[PDB]
Write a protein that binds this ligand. Structure first.
Ligand code: NI
Length: 341
């Protein structure tokens, strides 16, 4: 059974609600982004209308084999009518194709559903600026003050400089980057670009990347591993055993691996600046965990919400425990009292 926080009152709409069977009364299923906790349940046998971005639509078609007749892609930043209700999709600054949805209810209520997002001040000049929002369905992944991490730009700067130094010192080093889903593509693309290489990967990952409308992509990625000095591997293979084994396969072309594991937040963030980050090393293998986040920090989240001044907030993450829910409600009240809405 579908939980309440995936239902849009006064509509026949649900958001990211594919794992509950047929939801009573749902005339259109919205999908915010192509990540497995959100699409869980979709397949080629799904026969209700799905509304989503162009990029999400490419992935539904090519990776999950959803039939074209049920895929309804919408352009961003454009007022659209769906089953008699005005909607707008906005960029969520999450992974490729990820959106927030603004719903304009027939009774005059306005609802913003953020999906998953990394709040940014640039959102304060989208179509959000033009009217009041009554209810906010909020990505609360990191809704606690301990969650600090650097900007995406600082993290990429660290990775580019790290990789460029290592390979200039040793032209026979291989760079490996972990992945398990879409998002965080800037990590491996930025590193390959500074090294003048394409990125090598499996046919399945290449297929996924070809759905994402990235400019000049044919110039940046390849399935030919042997022509490339930046390789992508599944995240589970980014450990001393998995990399040792991968190095065997490269046929004495390389004598050193430097590997990156983009994580979300980790507790080493409470003590250590990005500048100061060091790898785990064994032999000729080094592994850097870098805190590249596609979710709001606490401070970014707070700033967005205090700007928006919603009348009510409904969290969509960390909703399973009483202690979590109580913690989040206390922060929402502080924010409201401090800003005065
Ligand atoms: Ni996500």
């Amino acid at each position: 059974t579908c939980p309440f926080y995936k239902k849009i009152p006064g509509t026949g709409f649900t958001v990211d609600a594919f794992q509950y069977g047929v939801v009573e009364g749902c005339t259109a299923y919205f999908l915010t982004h192509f990540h497995s906790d959100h699409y869980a349940g979709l397949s080629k046998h799904f026969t209700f209308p799905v509304y989503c971005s162009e990029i999400t639509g490419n992935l539904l078609k090519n990776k999950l084999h959803v039939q074209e007749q049920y895929i309804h892609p919408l352009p961003l930043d454009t007022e659209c009518i769906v089953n008699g209700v005005k909607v707008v999709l906005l960029d969520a600054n999450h992974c490729p194709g990820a959106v927030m949805i603004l719903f304009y209810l027939p009774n005059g209520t306005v609802i913003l559903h953020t999906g998953d997002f990394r709040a940014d001040p640039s959102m304060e000049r989208s179509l959000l600026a033009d009217q009041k929002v009554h209810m906010l369905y909020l990505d609360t992944t990191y809704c606690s003050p301990e969650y600090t991490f650097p900007s995406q730009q600082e993290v990429i700067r660290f990775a580019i400089n790290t990789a460029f130094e290592a390979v200039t010192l040793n032209p026979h080093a291989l760079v490996v980057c972990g992945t398990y889903s879409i998002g965080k593509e800037k990590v491996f693309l930025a590193i390959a670009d500074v090294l003048g290489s394409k990125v090598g990967m499996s046919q399945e990952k290449y297929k996924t990347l070809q759905c994402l409308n990235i400019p000049e992509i044919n110039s940046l990625i390849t399935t030919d591993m042997c022509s490339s000095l930046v390789h992508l591997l599944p995240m589970m293979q980014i450990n001393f055993k998995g990399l040792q084994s991968h190095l065997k396969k490269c046929g004495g072309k390389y004598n050193q691996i430097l590997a990156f594991r983009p994580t979300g937040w980790t507790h080493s963030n409470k003590f250590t600046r990005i500048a100061d980050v060091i790898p785990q090393t064994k032999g000729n293998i080094s592994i850097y965990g870098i805190p590249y986040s596609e979710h709001s920090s606490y401070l970014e989240m707070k700033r967005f919400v205090q700007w928006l001044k919603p009348q009510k907030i409904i969290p969509t993450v960390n909703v399973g425990t009483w202690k979590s829910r109580s913690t989040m409600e206390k922060y929402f009240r502080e924010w409201k009292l401090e800003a005065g809405y």
